[PDB]
Design a protein around this ligand. Structure first.
Ligand SMILES: CC[C@H]1OC(=O)[C@H](C)[C@@H](O[C@H]2C[C@@](C)(OC)[C@@H](O)[C@H](C)O2)[C@H](C)[C@@H](O[C@@H]2O[C@H](C)C[C@H](N(C)C)[C@H]2O)[C@](C)(O)C[C@@H](C)C(=O)[C@H](C)[C@@H](O)[C@]1(C)O
Ligand SMILES: CCCCCCCCCCCCCCCCCCCC(=O)O[C@H](COC(=O)CCCCCCCCCCCCCC)COP(=O)(O)OCCN
Ligand SMILES: CCCCCCCCCCCCCCCCCCCC(=O)O[C@H](COC(=O)CCCCCCCCCCCCCC)COP(=O)(O)OCCN
Ligand SMILES: CCCCCCCCCCCCCCCCCCCC(=O)O[C@H](COC(=O)CCCCCCCCCCCCCC)COP(=O)(O)OCCN
Ligand SMILES: CCCCCCCCCCCCCCCCCCCC(=O)O[C@H](COC(=O)CCCCCCCCCCCCCC)COP(=O)(O)OCCN
Ligand SMILES: CCCCCCCCCCCCCCCCCCCC(=O)O[C@H](COC(=O)CCCCCCCCCCCCCC)COP(=O)(O)OCCN
Ligand SMILES: CCCCCCCCCCCCCCCCCCCC(=O)O[C@H](COC(=O)CCCCCCCCCCCCCC)COP(=O)(O)OCCN
Ligand SMILES: CCCCCCCCCCCCCCCCCCCC(=O)O[C@H](COC(=O)CCCCCCCCCCCCCC)COP(=O)(O)OCCN
Ligand SMILES: CCCCCCCCCCCCCCCCCCCC(=O)O[C@H](COC(=O)CCCCCCCCCCCCCC)COP(=O)(O)OCCN
Ligand SMILES: CCCCCCCCCCCCCCCCCCCC(=O)O[C@H](COC(=O)CCCCCCCCCCCCCC)COP(=O)(O)OCCN
Lengths: 1043, 150, 50, 100, 50, 50
């Protein structure tokens, strides 16, 4: 191929044009998002059962639904959660190799066959079935300060929500807040005065407000002589509060009908009254936009902003829209950084080529070949159904240093042949191709075999590695094809013959540089000749360096993704058990006053009534959004410092309750720092007290008699709370004229709400609820005054029927795989394997009686699997590399010499990481570098580059020994010939990676994490290879005399 | 998969036209073979077959029917329930019937949902909130034996 | 539809609307005050109309 | 018992608004009549599968079915991925019995 | 499926009440596995004979 | 008629609209394909021009 495309440059140009067209078509036809889908399919139900505790809701709805969700194809596990708010959740996590749509339809079908066995109110409210996966794009906040939050919610649902979900790319718009309904607050005193009940109000609301269906006059089965037919209309529903206030509750003979406005008050209100959102202290309405698959993030965000402006041009007086957070600017910054890196790499390549080759027509070849390889990689990633995200952009940035080295080495070999033999460009290009074609093919095969195993892992880490693998391997393959197809043609047509000895008569700065480079080359050759004399000590020094590198690598902390300054920090506030929402609102106001006192925070969003740990009146959460990175370029301005300052200000200011501020890490499925999660399940259903005692015993075993960092071993659920349980006496009720349904009706009418009917409110149907006049249900001594009706009348004060008392009840119920479960979160301190800690936890759980099991949750489920797939994959990759090198060199010993340069890059990268950590530590900073995914990617890249250099050197040394030279002379000549291209490529790669070494701003953690690794690895690997590769060749030649 | 989806769609359109008992028990759709792959035994000498059947339905059947490849797990038996054997010779003495027994069982064994004292839509100055709970349900044989018919 | 006819490009007797030809209907306005003053519940009217 | 505007404003418009974002959706058309009935037709685009489209439509419809009126949920919303043009017309004739 | 069921039963046996056990006197995978082993032995014998 | 009252097509008419901008693209694609194939086969930029 190298000689076929050299006589036909037009064919190579046509192939390059086709590749460019395919790449442009793929680039224009790719989705754009900040992060790919790395999680597994999860389905949630979110049932509703108002006015109920956790145990009742659980055992009535959640257990019944969970015991039927067994047999769904691909079910990994399932969990059930219930609280005292009146809501439940059944989360089914599905095994991989499963489609989320099929899983959702299966869950819906399984729920349809058990829905008729649930309570009546659960069927009235309904049971949803959605997927937990979400592609969040933007947050639209509406704040008026001149209108109620319910009015803003209604306006957004009627004029803003249907306008945003119609835009190209939008997949879902979710409102945060209860809808509008007709609430009737019924005073029980008026009912007892008029001798009425809540059932009377329900019957009056369901009878006086009903849809009427009349039909048609002159219907089809008519009589002979019908000429006209007309639909009959009759309105039988109410739509205003004055109409609901005139509902007749009881009609008497003399008149005096009791209306709904005589014993209650009707008005428009909300349906839940639970959550409350504020932005900087003012009322706000929250709308979350989810990006749709096969859509773009930048264009969708721009269209959403334009539509929001066009809508705000019609807003009422006082309203205002804001977009405080947007995940579409991260991909923008990534694309601009990729473009800047490509431009800088092109400039550096041009500078180095003009400095080393002393001509301008040598720099056009890399500038023409690199973009074609990038376009080919883009086309391949578009064919595989991938998308443009931060990981793909980072992979493209890392592959720029490898795609240019092929063109660099080709042009360098051509120029060296032209300057040595003085031949024209055609013959020189033919000779260089005939020399390096097999080497290029072998290098491509080795790189493919090294990058393939990255796309074979399991879990979210495998999905993250697949992006880098499929990008870099495709880019490398296209670069190899271009170097074999288009580079020789350009070198043969775009170059001119050099006159005999033209280099020496040249003078000036170029002459001085040539003299200095020749002196450096002579010194390097002398040092290499000195190294090839003392082979034993050099080999033992190499073994020592390899073992030191392995030791430094094994002593590094393990993580997945470094915490990134996303521009915002979350805050969770918890109050004591039994706290109302007024105290939570006061605490949120204090938190806002403290947060706006920090200049690094721009907007603060507080949510009252909801928290990630739990949903209650004492829980609350907020999101302090920071300013742009350009305005936070200082020491104590990053997200971690702002979170620490907020926590320190909260611990000294928040009198009631406690609030903790945390910076959200990268993708939550691959979340680090959580430690080790355990779920203790009760098998025999002994109760809650026994399970709590077993949990406390396990915590004591892990804390004192264990090694799980006692400063972290603690329960992670929610302690019990005082309750007002009512113990009814059936004997006392049977002795009187009171039944048992009377107590049920009284308890349902006293505290809880009821959903009775529907009504059209300007087009849309809304609910009608009765809350029983909350002014009454305020003190514990109100249920004991509820007189329950007897057979004839009502005289029992409910103190003779039942006895009220105070106890400690659970406020949250959790089940795992069909058993009551309690969650624990431990953590190993340091220098202790997670496997032995998990084995100790398992043995400790087994120490308890048979009936208490343990199961892992979250990332621990993946850590339970032995880490043997990575070692096996790397061993298979090494075997494939050895086989490819043996097929290339036609020997069984030369690959042994080529494989000896692998530990050099690893030792260099480990030493660089340790040095950077020490530098950060001595200067007050904390070590921010560990053995994460970015470290592995950088190590793979540096080892691939070192393998390519070693393969080239070994090929040049082997093909020079078959001409009548010894091993030492052949190695020296190969080193002297490969000194220049290696130096040029190393300088280019280092100067291109330097911008990523001191990167500061958006997505700077991963940038520095890859930059330091690649920089130190490449530097140490080159510095060691340039003196150890010929030594390895000589050692392998003298140890295994060939056949 | 698509066949089962369309079968569920067709069944949902005629599910309300069936008798009340069929809807109470429900209609189960499955896609599995009619032959047995294996038979699991639970031999013991301390418990009867009823307790073993209940234990298998509560702890063994769900654990086995979630294995990849399993299509159905038929237990040769049934889980536990509360059986009430009525003597018609005694119902004629008190002039009772099965309808009275059913009504008493449905009215005296219903779950109660109280709510919360100090709910969220409250008055200014509320500091304590407490979930109110009432059992109102029977779970023992002698508790069911004390149901009032008159 | 009127300007599509007599234009040369479209032939008459084919240009028609796809609507449903909005028709007259019978509207029954119920007076709750009269039904309450005469002793007629709102459910009786609904059963009669159904 | 609904008008041509109540059926759309309460049932059809909600499904139409919640049916956006489906992969391959070309366009939609809602039509309600005075007989208390409505039809939402979703015409997809090429490069789209039929079974996957029906499954996604069912998933989008079920998650929004908790908002429609109660009587609609009692009757239910039926899905039909069928054509509308006639292929054949079978006619049964007889002189000994009526058409019923 | 038989292997997974047997492993799950062996795991669940640790939580059984005192007195009960488990066993699968009817299983069809044993015949399949023994037939596979017999065919492999026949293949090895054919190889050595050749 | 004015603004606000847009126009949509139904049935084959939409497809006919899609046949408004695809013909020129198809002709240009065929011409460029013939040009590239001739230039790659005969190794010249002047033969495909003729
Ligand atoms: C990029 C992933 C994003 O996740 C979400 O946005 C999801 C969609 C909500 O959580 C989800 C969590 C979930 C799934 O919990 C089951 C869901 O049910 C609720 C509604 O919020 C979030 C945090 C919203 O919370 C919700 O804001 C509403 C205005 C009120 C609601 N509150 C009344 C409850 C509250 O939770 C809120 C405030 O927009 C977060 C804004 C301010 C952010 O800046 C944060 C950083 C988000 O960009 C995000 C976390 O990065
Ligand atoms: C896309 C279009 C690609 C078209 C490629 C055409 C190349 C044809 C070369 C014909 C030729 O004479 O080469 C012979 C060898 O071919 C070969 O080496 C085999 C070429 C096989 C075609 C590979 C196509 C690319 C695959 C990428 C996926 C000469 O042989 P020689 O003795 O001169 O030396 C070979 C050292 N390799
Ligand atoms: C890849 C799929 C095709 C595999 C082809 C294997 C070819 C093996 C090499 C044989 C070979 O060297 O023949 C030469 C290359 O022809 C060829 O290689 C012709 C086929 C070129 C690859 C076509 C790829 C299409 C995509 C022509 O030999 P010759 O006798 O014609 O003289 C040529 C004077 N160097
Ligand atoms: C000294 C020697 C100098 C030699 C030359 C110097 C450097 C030359 C540089 C040339 C740069 C070429 C730039 C190509 C423009 C890319 C346009 C992409 C358009 C596109 O979406 O993809 C194409 C249309 O597809 C469709 O069917 C979509 C329909 C609408 C397309 C509208 C486009 C009309 C025609 C425009 C020309 C297209 C470019 C020629 C292919 C098909 O691309 P593909 O995926 O089929 O690629 C074939 C893979 N095997
Ligand atoms: C080396 C080339 C690679 C450089 C990195 C390019 C990454 C840019 C991708 C982000 C992006 O979507 O920009 C597109 C503009 O580019 C385009 O529409 C085609 C740009 C072609 C770039 C030529 C690169 C030469 C180098 C927007 O396009 P879109 O997806 O919004 O378009 C919708 C059509 N339906
Ligand atoms: C479902 C069924 C599953 C089937 C599973 C079986 C899979 C078997 C795949 C075998 C893969 C072996 C890969 C070995 C690659 C070695 C490449 C280096 C050898 C090499 O470059 O020799 C050149 C010629 O190569 C060549 O002519 C060969 C070019 C590359 C061959 C790649 C073969 C297909 C890979 C896909 C030079 O040759 P020279 O004599 O001029 O010496 C030049 C002296 N530097
Ligand atoms: C004219 C220019 C035309 C450019 C067109 C770009 C698209 C190339 C399509 C080739 C398809 C090859 C498929 C392949 O290599 O393995 C895939 C899986 O890869 C893996 O899982 C491991 C692959 C490791 C990376 C392989 C790098 C190959 C680079 C691409 C070819 C470069 C050629 C160099 C000239 C197969 O996936 P599938 O069968 O599931 O497909 C699902 C489709 N959505
Ligand atoms: C983790 C693993 C990482 C490394 C990959 C595995 C490396 C294992 C292979 C090491 C072999 C090194 C010794 C080879 C050797 O010197 O023996 C040769 C003679 O032996 C022979 O004639 C037969 C040697 C056959 C070795 C085949 C290994 C296959 C491995 C597949 C798994 C003489 O060597 P020489 O240099 O004179 O070569 C002659 C070519 N003319
Ligand atoms: C893009 C699509 C464009 C397709 C145009 C194919 C152009 C082939 C050029 C050609 O005629 O090669 C003849 C056959 O050459 C050969 O000996 C090897 C012929 C290999 C042709 C490979 C075609 C790949 C097609 C990919 C689609 C030269 O003839 P020659 O006898 O001078 O031979 C030269 C080798 N020494
Ligand atoms: C509508 C469809 C239109 C199809 C595209 C039309 C493009 C016309 C380009 C004409 C180029 C000039 C032709 C010419 O004679 O000048 C060449 C020299 O120019 C040069 O040295 C540079 C000319 C480079 C032309 C690049 C054309 C790329 C087209 C990309 C399409 C996308 C001759 O050169 P010669 O080698 O033919 O000498 C003859 C050996 N027989």
């Amino acid at each position: 191929m190298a000689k076929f495309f050299i006589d036909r440059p037009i064919f190579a140009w046509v192939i390059s044009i086709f590749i460019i067209a395919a790449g442009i078509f793929g680039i224009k036809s790719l989705p754009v998002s900040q992060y790919p889908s790395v999680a597994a399919p999860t389905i949630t139900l979110h049932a509703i059962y108002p006015g109920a505790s956790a145990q009742v809701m659980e055992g009535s709805v959640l257990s019944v639904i969970e015991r039927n969700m067994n047999g769904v194809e691909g079910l990994d596990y399932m969990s059930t959660s219930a609280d005292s708010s009146g809501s439940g959740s059944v989360s089914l996590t599905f095994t991989p190799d499963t489609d989320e749509n099929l899983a959702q339809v299966e869950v819906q079908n399984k729920l349809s066959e058990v829905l008729s066995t649930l309570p009546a109110t659960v069927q009235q409210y309904g049971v949803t079935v959605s997927k937990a996966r979400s592609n969040f794009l933007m947050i639209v906040m509406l704040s008026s300060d001149v209108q109620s939050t319910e009015e803003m919610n209604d306006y957004a649902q009627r004029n803003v929500v249907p306008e945003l979900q119609r835009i190209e790319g939008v997949g879902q718009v979710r409102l945060f807040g209860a809808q509008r309904a007709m609430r009737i607050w019924v005073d029980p005193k008026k009912l007892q005065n008029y001798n009425l009940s809540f059932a009377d109000v329900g019957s009056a609301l369901s009878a006086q407000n009903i849809q009427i269906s009349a039909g048609s006059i002159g219907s089809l089965p008519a009589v002979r002589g019908q000429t006209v037919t007309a639909t009959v209309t009759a309105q039988g529903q109410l739509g205003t509060a004055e109409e609901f206030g005139n509902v007749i509750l009881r009609a008497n003979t003399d008149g005096s009908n009791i209306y709904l406005k005589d014993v209650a008050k009707v008005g428009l209100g909300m349906e839940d009254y639970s959550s409350s959102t504020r932005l900087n202290g003012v009322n706000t309405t929250g709308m979350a936009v989810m990006l749709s698959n096969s859509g773009n993030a930048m264009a969708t965000a721009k269209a959403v902003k334009e539509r929001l402006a066009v809508l705000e041009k019609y807003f009422p007086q006082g309203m205002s829209w804001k977009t405080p957070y947007d995940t579409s600017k991260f991909v923008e910054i990534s694309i601009e950084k990729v473009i800047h890196t490509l431009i800088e790499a092109m400039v550096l390549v041009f500078v180095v080529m003009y400095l080393f080759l002393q001509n301008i027509r040598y720099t056009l070849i890399p500038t023409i070949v690199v973009p074609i390889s990038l376009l080919g990689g883009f086309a391949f990633i578009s064919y595989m159904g991938m998308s443009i995200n931060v990981l793909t952009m980072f992979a493209m940035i890392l592959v720029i240093g490898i795609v240019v080295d092929d063109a660099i080495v080709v042009v360098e070999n051509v120029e060296r042949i032209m300057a040595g033999e003085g031949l024209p460009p055609k013959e020189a290009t033919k000779k260089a191709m005939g020399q390096i074609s097999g080497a290029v093919i072998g290098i491509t095969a080795v790189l493919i075999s090294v990058f393939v195993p990255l796309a074979m892992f399991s879990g979210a880490a495998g999905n993250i590695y697949k992006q880098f693998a499929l990008t870099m391997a495709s880019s490398i393959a296209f670069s190899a094809f271009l170097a074999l197809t288009l580079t020789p043609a350009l070198c043969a047509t775009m170059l001119k013959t050099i006159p005999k000895g033209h280099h020496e008569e040249k003078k000036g700065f170029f002459g001085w540089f040539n003299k200095k480079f020749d002196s450096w080359t002579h010194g390097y050759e002398g040092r290499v000749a000195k190294v090839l004399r003392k082979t034993f000590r050099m080999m033992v020094v190499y073994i020592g360096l390899a073992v030191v590198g392995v030791f430094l690598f094994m002593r590094l902390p393990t993580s997945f993704l470094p915490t990134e300054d996303q521009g915002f920090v979350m805050v969770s506030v918890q109050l004591p058990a039994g706290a109302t929402k007024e105290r939570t609102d006061a605490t949120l106001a204090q938190v806002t006053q403290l947060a706006k006192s920090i200049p690094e925070i721009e907007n603060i969003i507080t949510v009252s009534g909801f928290s990630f740990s739990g949903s209650g009146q004492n829980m609350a959460m907020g999101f302090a959004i920071l300013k742009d990175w350009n305005e936070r370029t200082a020491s104590g301005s990053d997200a971690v410092a702002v979170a620490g300052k907020l926590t320190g200000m909260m611990m000294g200011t928040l009198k009631d309750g406690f609030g903790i501020a945390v910076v959200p890490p990268p993708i939550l499925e691959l979340g680090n720092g959580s430690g080790l999660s355990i779920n203790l399940q009760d098998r025999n259903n002994t109760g809650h007290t026994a399970l709590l005692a077993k949990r406390n015993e396990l915590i004591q075993k892990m804390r004192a008699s264990g090694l799980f960092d006692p400063s972290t071993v603690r329960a992670g659920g929610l302690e019990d709370s005082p309750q007002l349980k009512i113990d009814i006496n059936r004997a006392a009720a049977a002795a009187q004229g009171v039944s048992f349904a009377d107590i049920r009706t009284a308890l349902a009418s006293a505290l809880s709400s009821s959903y009775v009917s529907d009504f059209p409110n300007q087009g849309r149907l809304q609910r009608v609820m009765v809350q029983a006049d909350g002014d009454a249900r305020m003190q514990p001594a109100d249920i004991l005054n509820l007189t329950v009706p007897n057979s004839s009348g009502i005289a029992v004060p409910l103190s003779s029927i039942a006895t009220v008392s105070w106890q400690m009840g659970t406020e949250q119920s959790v089940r795992f795989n069909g058993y009551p479960a309690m969650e624990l979160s431990g953590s190993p301190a340091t220098g202790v394997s997670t496997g032995q800690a998990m084995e100790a936890v398992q043995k400790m759980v087994d120490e308890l009686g048979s009936g208490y099991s343990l199961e892992w949750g979250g990332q621990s489920r993946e850590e339970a699997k032995g880490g043997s797939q990575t070692i096996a994959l790397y061993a298979l990759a090494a075997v494939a590399v050895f086989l490819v090198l043996a097929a290339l060199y036609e020997s069984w010993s030369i690959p042994l010499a080529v494989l000896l340069v692998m530990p050099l890059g690893l030792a260099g990268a480990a030493a660089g990481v340790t040095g950077r950590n020490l530098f950060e530590g001595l200067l007050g900073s904390v070590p921010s570098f560990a053995n994460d995914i970015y470290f592995q990617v950088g190590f793979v890249t540096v080892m691939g580059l070192s393998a390519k250099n070693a393969i080239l050197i070994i090929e040049f040394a082997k093909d020079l020994q078959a001409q009548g030279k010894s091993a030492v002379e052949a190695a020296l000549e190969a080193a002297r010939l490969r000194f220049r291209p290696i130096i040029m490529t190393s300088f280019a790669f280092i100067l291109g990676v330097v911008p990523l070494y001191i990167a500061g701003g958006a997505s700077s953690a991963s940038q520095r994490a890859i930059g330091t690794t690649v920089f130190w690895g490449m530097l140490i690997g080159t510095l060691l290879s340039v003196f150890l590769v010929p030594l390895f060749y000589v050692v392998v030649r003298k140890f295994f005399k060939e056949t």
